[PDB]
UniProtKB/TrEMBL annotation, chain B:
InterPro entries, sorted: Ribosomal_eS17, Ribosomal_eS17_CS, Ribosomal_eS17_sf
Protein's recorded name: KLLA0B01474p
Organism: Kluyveromyces lactis (strain ATCC 8585 / CBS 2359 / DSM 70799 / NBRC 1267 / NRRL Y-1140 / WM37)
PANTHER family documented for this protein: 40S RIBOSOMAL PROTEIN S17 (PTHR10732:SF0)
NCBIfam families hit by this protein: PRK01151.1 (NF002242)
Protein family membership: Belongs to the eukaryotic ribosomal protein eS17 family.
Cellular compartments per GO CC: cytosol; ribonucleoprotein complex; ribosome
Single Gene Ontology BP annotation: translation
UniProtKB/TrEMBL annotation, chain D:
Provenance organism: Kluyveromyces lactis (strain ATCC 8585 / CBS 2359 / DSM 70799 / NBRC 1267 / NRRL Y-1140 / WM37)
Recorded superkingdom: Eukaryota
CC annotations in GO: small ribosomal subunit
Stated family: Belongs to the universal ribosomal protein uS12 family.
Covered range of the whole protein: 2 to 97 of 145
Listed name of the protein: KLLA0B11231p
Molecular functions per Gene Ontology: structural constituent of ribosome
Alphabetically ordered keywords of this record: Hydroxylation, Ribonucleoprotein, Ribosomal protein
UniProt KW Ribosomal protein keyword: yes
Biological processes, Gene Ontology terms: translation
From TrEMBL, chain E:
GO MF entries: RNA binding; structural constituent of ribosome
Name of the protein: Small ribosomal subunit protein uS5
Occurrences of domain S5 DRBM (ranges): 46-109
UniProt keyword annotations, A-Z: Metal-binding, Ribonucleoprotein, Ribosomal protein
Residues of the full protein shown: 36 to 255 of 259
Keyword Ribosomal protein applies: yes
Organism: Kluyveromyces lactis (strain ATCC 8585 / CBS 2359 / DSM 70799 / NBRC 1267 / NRRL Y-1140 / WM37)
Protein family (similarity comment): Belongs to the universal ribosomal protein uS5 family.
Automatic annotation (TrEMBL), chain F:
Coiled coil: none
Family: Belongs to the universal ribosomal protein uS3 family.
Complete-protein stretch covered: 120 to 178 of 237
The name this protein goes by in its record: Small ribosomal subunit protein uS3
Length: 219, 130, 25, 96, 220, 59, 102, 129, 87
RNA sequence: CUCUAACUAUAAAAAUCUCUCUUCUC
RNA sequence: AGGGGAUCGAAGAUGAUCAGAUACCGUCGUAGUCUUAACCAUAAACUAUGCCGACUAGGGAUCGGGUGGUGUUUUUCUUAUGACCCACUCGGCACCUUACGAGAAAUCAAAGUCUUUGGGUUCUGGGGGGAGUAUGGUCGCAAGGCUGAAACUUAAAGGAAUUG
């Protein structure tokens, strides 16, 4: 099996906790996801972070198995996880799709956005149902960042995490890209934290980018 | 009833997206640019194209707008995107290396067999009436 | 036509025929 | 599961149910009641002779405008009277 | 004739490169075919003939706008069928596009033995059925050389299939040719959808042709 | 269709043919065979697209 | 065919309810197929609030309201503009028309 | 009321197979169900089932492996003469190369091929393939 | 399937769902085939060597695809206790 | 990541209609 | 038949609207509406879905009951109740999503587990019209109810949905 180097390192679990991945799943629950653990008395179910990291490493193993990098195509329609996907497509040789999905992007072969990949990564099944339906129509696996409340129809291996955080999605994409690059071998050893930062995959509202520019242009 | 149909709008959009450094705020200079950099058959269409180009340029000067893009704007967007804060926003950089949890995720950490310095706090299971 | 009024017309025909039979019974 | 009974000892009601339902057909009802023998102009007869009474033609329906040349015949076997049709271009004059 | 057929899909690129040799590789991995020229390349002798031409009218404010529905069946009489149904303005274009769809929708069939296998399969393997609209078609194996006891359209579909002997039974409004042919198509394609004792052992899941030969796709 | 095919083989940007009359029926009917695109308004109708009208005598 | 799986009645398990009369045409209609509108309003409109306030003793009168639940028929409800015909995919929605004002 | 218990068992098996599961919980668990599932085990259409004593009719937990496609009882256990076995196989089984009409003979509950081998026939129980 | 002399007459002995043992139709345009890369001692994904699981379109449509993949990967020693055999 | 407010309100009368329906194949 | 007798209102009386209007709008208005006995047994008596039994899919609520909470306000110092909150369960009128199933579809979580056809069982239908008519029984004071054809005629009548 996987060598014990692939266990849940203290810093990586600690990061997962800090981004409040476990904190929120839902006040409700669907029996497709047993990744629940110790439903909090606040009525906010806790997510088993170890199971989440196991799903992350499984998804990394699946992605690394693809011989040609740009048949891994990652979707994000909701704002909170747009930038991260682009950033992911920067490091791993994946193809990003942000904002709208222009339906018919998988079945219709005439559209100039017609990409025929071998794997699809989805930030949220409930928002990206169109991509899931296209992948169904064209026989494509769907590694979706499913929450404990998102539906799991036409959804393959599903990373259980938060979808309302603006922190969880970016860091989940970080761990995914980091593990994929370790698997490929571009990153030499899987112990150093890969200096570039989790905040790189975080969301950036235009109002705060304007504020940051104003603070940068003050001097 | 002036609506400036497909042709003028698309031509002006392409004109901006390919020639922003040369376009100006003035209608007459942009009219001459439309004459020299593009082969508009008639001259009424040329004037309409230059007018909408000036309007779009003024809108861009006011701020960034949807649809159209050019080298300078996309470079600025990429540079703003590459912003990564030097100070850490995780790993308990705040709250004196202490992060607050409840019992349940504390037992999660315990059963995971990891040390993970925590701070317990009951969540007052009484829910807000909203 | 409505089934209601066809029914009623049949009932009135039965009216007349029943009175005639009662007269000649 | 279905309206009919299914038990191994339910032959009686199945048979009587089929026997009661058979009257819903028209061929079976005609065959058993013997309506052909009693009411039809011929009783189970493919052909029948008769005597011509008069020589009439009847107009056709709406989409077809013509007068088909028929003949009223009183049957000899029982005495019923029926109209019959002489089928061809110039056969009306042939029958007197 | 004049045909360049620049491949726009990865499967078409692999086929044009000559890397997929048999259509069984396409059928096995449930690969999606969107170019009829792939099917032309893999099956050079796909015969076809128009089942029916049907005038279909739409009532507009000015007259009645009439198109034509062509029902085309394509096959090679060796266990491969496709059923295209198209609607178009001109009858010739309707037939051409129906042939195109039929080639796109080619499907493999599982011919079997009625009993005591001696030569090549002569009939289907098991009883199969399909239902389109209200038309339910039931195909039942028959002894060797029993002909095709079927309506002329279904009979000709079996002839294009290569099934030489089969019994059939149709229930419903088999009048409508498209529904009957679609039900028969569902049944004959369901013939490979029935698990049979002789199909019980598991296989090793040979890797997909676009995984082993992904390099020859993705025109750079 | 052969005429249209030859016309677009010649390099034309669009051809159109109207055949009106008693096409295999007593009642009159008009068949349209078009390919490419044909403009209809403005002297582009006079400048680019050229037209021809002819009568054919049959039995 | 069924235009309404609920049959419009909204009864589902009663068999018979007691009818009520229409406010306009006095149509004896069942109490659930008797589309109801709770008219709560001011006894003096905004057109005369200033006039009443200036010319009233008991400074800062509460200005009491008037409440009436109107039991329309259905023909009047279509005609008196209370309820409108809807798309067959819009008939699904039973929520009130999206909070007239916030 | 529960009239034919084997019907309930086979219906539960069919429902839990069509949905893609690998297990069934049959409640009443008579002799006939045990023999039927034992025949299916002998012919491979079923996996590894289990009897759960309750002191009250027991229950059965059935393990499947997706090999089966349809069970089914012939609810009126028709007296099947040895001549009528072939007609039942033709009317029920999809092909002559496989399928089994499970029928109860005086020599026990057996598949139709085994009964034809013993040259004995009785009432018909159901069909599996 | 088998000719009497002993040669195969079937064409394309079809795949079967690795989770429900049901065959995969030729036109089953919902089914997928997952590849999971083998991992050596130092975490380097060995190329061209992996393990494949054919998930049917039916379970994917139902919503049991991820659970089935979890179980199937746990059985062949890929994920540690991600799936419990007793719910 | 925090909320429950505004409102109305018309029904005059209007009946009837004759022909005749015509192929889609590379 | 006996009692009552407000309202509203078959018949009727009119006043309007109209070409006519003994119809719709309006005003009066008997029988009736309300009852105690005795009849009547029919309704779009509708969920147009027979009953009993099993299984199959996700999401919340709602009613009746019962379990547990180291739960919250309650106040009778604390507690016991009650009232809520959270979780579960049984039963009921129901509802949202979906097809992976069924249908000719509208649609149905049953109208599913039906050509891969059998859990038990009752009633009904065999193109439309004639016709729920006649006749013969039977019930009823009467009204009418139950049972209930044929002769003959007809190539359609009808269901759902699509475009105008
Ligand atoms: Mg005449
Ligand atoms: Mg134009
Ligand atoms: Mg113009
Ligand atoms: Mg209607
Ligand atoms: Mg209503
Ligand atoms: Mg009730
Ligand atoms: Mg009295
Ligand atoms: Mg009057
Ligand atoms: Mg008057
Ligand atoms: Mg009146
Ligand atoms: Mg009065
Ligand atoms: Mg009745
Ligand atoms: Mg009824
Ligand atoms: Mg009839
Ligand atoms: Mg009738
Ligand atoms: Mg009588
Ligand atoms: Mg209709
Ligand atoms: Zn009203």
């Amino acid at each position: 099996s996987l060598p014990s180097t692939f266990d849940l390192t203290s810093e990586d679990a600690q990061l997962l906790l800090a981004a409040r991945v476990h904190l929120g799943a839902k006040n409700v629950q669907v029996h497709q996801e047993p990744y629940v653990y110790k439903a909090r008395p606040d009525g906010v179910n806790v997510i088993n972070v170890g199971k989440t990291w196991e799903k992350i490493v499984l998804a990394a193993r699946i992605i690394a198995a693809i011989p040609n990098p740009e048949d891994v195509v990652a979707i994000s329609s909701r704002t909170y996880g747009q930038r991260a996907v682009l950033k992911y497509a920067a490091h791993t040789g994946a193809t990003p799709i942000a904002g709208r999905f222009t339906p018919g992007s998988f079945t219709n072969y005439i559209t100039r956005s017609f990409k025929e990949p071998r794997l699809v990564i989805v930030t949220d099944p409930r928002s990206d149902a169109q991509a899931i339906k296209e992948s169904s129509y064209v026989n494509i696996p769907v590694i979706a960042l499913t929450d404990l409340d998102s539906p799991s129809e036409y959804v393959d291996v599903a990373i259980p995490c938060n979808n309302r955080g603006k922190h969880s999605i970016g860091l989940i994409w970080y761990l995914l890209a980091r593990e994929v690059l370790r698997l490929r071998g571009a990153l030499p050893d899987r112990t150093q934290p890969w200096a570039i930062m989790p905040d790189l995959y975080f969301y950036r509202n235009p109002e705060e980018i304007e504020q940051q520019t104003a603070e940068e242009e003050a001097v | 009833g002036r609506v400036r149909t497909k042709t003028v709008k698309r031509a002006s959009k392409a004109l901006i997206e390919k020639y922003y450094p040369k376009l100006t705020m003035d209608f007459q200079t942009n009219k001459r640019l439309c004459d020299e950099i593009a082969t508009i058959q008639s001259k009424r269409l040329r004037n309409k194209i230059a007018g909408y180009t000036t309007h779009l340029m003024k809108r861009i000067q006011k701020g960034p707008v949807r649809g159209i893009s050019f080298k300078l704007q996309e470079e600025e967007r990429e540079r703003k995107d590459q912003y990564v804060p030097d100070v850490s926003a995780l790993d308990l950089s705040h709250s004196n290396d202490v992060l607050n949890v409840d019992t349940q995720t504390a037992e999660l950490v315990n059963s995971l067999g990891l040390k993970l310095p925590l701070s317990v706090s009951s969540v007052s299971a009484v829910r807000d009436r909203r | 036509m409505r089934a209601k009024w066809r029914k009623k017309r049949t009932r009135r025909l039965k009216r007349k025929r029943r009175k005639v039979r009662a007269r000649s019974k | 599961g279905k309206g009919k009974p299914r038990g191994l000892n339910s032959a009686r009601k199945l048979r009587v149910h089929r026997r009661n339902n058979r009257w819903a057909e028209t061929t079976y009802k005609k065959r058993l009641l013997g309506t052909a023998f009693k009411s039809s102009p011929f009783g189970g007869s493919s052909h029948a002779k008769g005597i011509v009474l008069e020589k009439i033609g009847i107009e056709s329906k709406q989409p077809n405008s013509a007068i088909r040349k028929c003949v009223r015949v009183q049957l000899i076997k029982n005495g019923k009277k029926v109209t019959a049709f002489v089928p061809n271009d110039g056969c009306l004059n042939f029958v007197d | 004739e004049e045909k360049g057929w620049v491949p726009v899909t990865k499967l078409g690129r692999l086929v044009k490169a000559g890397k997929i040799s048999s259509i069984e590789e396409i059928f096995l991995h449930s690969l999606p075919v969107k170019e009829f020229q792939i099917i032309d390349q893999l099956l050079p002798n796909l015969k076809d003939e128009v089942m029916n031409i049907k005038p279909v009218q739409k009532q507009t404010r000015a007259g009645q706008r009439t198109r034509f529905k062509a029902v085309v069946v394509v096959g090679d009489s060796n266990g491969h069928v496709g059923l295209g149904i198209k609607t178009a303005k001109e009858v010739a274009g309707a037939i051409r596009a129906g042939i195109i769809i039929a080639k796109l929708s080619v499907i493999p069939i599982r011919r079997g033995y009625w009993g005591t296998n001696l030569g090549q399969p002569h009939s289907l393997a098991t009883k199969t059925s399909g239902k389109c609209g209200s038309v339910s078609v039931r195909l039942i194996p028959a002894p060797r050389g029993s002909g095709i006891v079927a309506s002329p359209a279904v009979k000709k579909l079996m002839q294009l299939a290569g099934v030489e002997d089969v019994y059939t039974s149709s229930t419903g409004s088999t009048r409508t040719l498209e529904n009957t042919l679609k039900a028969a198509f569902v049944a004959i394609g369901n013939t490979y959808g029935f698990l049979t004792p002789n199909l019980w052992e598991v296989q090793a899941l040979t890797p997909s042709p676009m995984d082993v030969y992904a390099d020859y796709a993705t025109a750079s | 269709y052969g005429v249209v095919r030859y016309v677009m083989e010649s390099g034309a940007k669009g051809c159109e043919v109207v055949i009106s009359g008693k096409l295999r029926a007593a009642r009159a009917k008009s068949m349209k065979f078009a390919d490419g695109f044909l403009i209809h308004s403005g002297q582009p109708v006079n400048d680019f697209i050229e037209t021809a009208t002819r009568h054919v005598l049959l039995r | 065919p069924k235009k309404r799986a609920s049959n419009g009645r909204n009864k589902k398990g009663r068999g018979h309810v007691k009818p009520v009369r229409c406010v306009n045409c006095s149509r004896s209609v069942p109490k659930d197929k008797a589309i109801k509108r709770m008219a709560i309003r001011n006894i003096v409109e905004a057109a005369a609030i200033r006039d009443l306030s200036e010319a009233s003793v008991y400074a800062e009168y509460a200005l009491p309201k008037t409440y009436n639940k109107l039991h329309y028929c259905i023909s009047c409800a279509i005609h008196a503009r209370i309820v409108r015909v809807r798309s067959r995919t819009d008939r699904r929605i039973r929520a009130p028309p999206q909070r007239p004002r916030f | 009321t529960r009239t034919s218990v084997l019907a309930d068992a086979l219906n539960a098996i069919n429902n839990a197979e069509k949905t893609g599961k690998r297990q069934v919980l049959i409640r009443p668990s008579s002799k006939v169900i045990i023999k039927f599932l034992q025949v299916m085990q002998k012919h491979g259409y079923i996996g590894e089932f289990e009897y759960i004593d309750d002191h009250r009719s027991g229950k059965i937990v059935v393990q499947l492996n997706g090999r089966l496609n349809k069970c089914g009882v012939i609810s009126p256990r028709f007296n099947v003469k040895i001549a009528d076995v072939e007609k039942w196989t033709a009317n029920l089984l999809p092909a002559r190369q496989f399928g089994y009409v499970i029928l109860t003979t005086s020599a026990g509950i057996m598949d139709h091929e085994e009964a034809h081998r013993k040259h004995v026939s009785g009432k018909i129980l159901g069909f599996v393939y | 399937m088998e000719n009497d002399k002993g040669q195969l007459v079937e064409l394309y002995v079809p795949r079967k769902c690795s989770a429900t043992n049901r065959i995969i139709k030729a036109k089953d345009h919902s089914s997928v085939q997952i590849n999971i890369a083998q991992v050596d001692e130092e975490g380097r994904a060995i190329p061209g060597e992996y393990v494949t699981y054919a998930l049917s379109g039916y379970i994917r449509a139902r919503g049991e695809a991820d659970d089935s993949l979890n179980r199937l990967a746990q059985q062949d020693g890929l994920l540690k206790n991600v799936w419990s055999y007793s719910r």
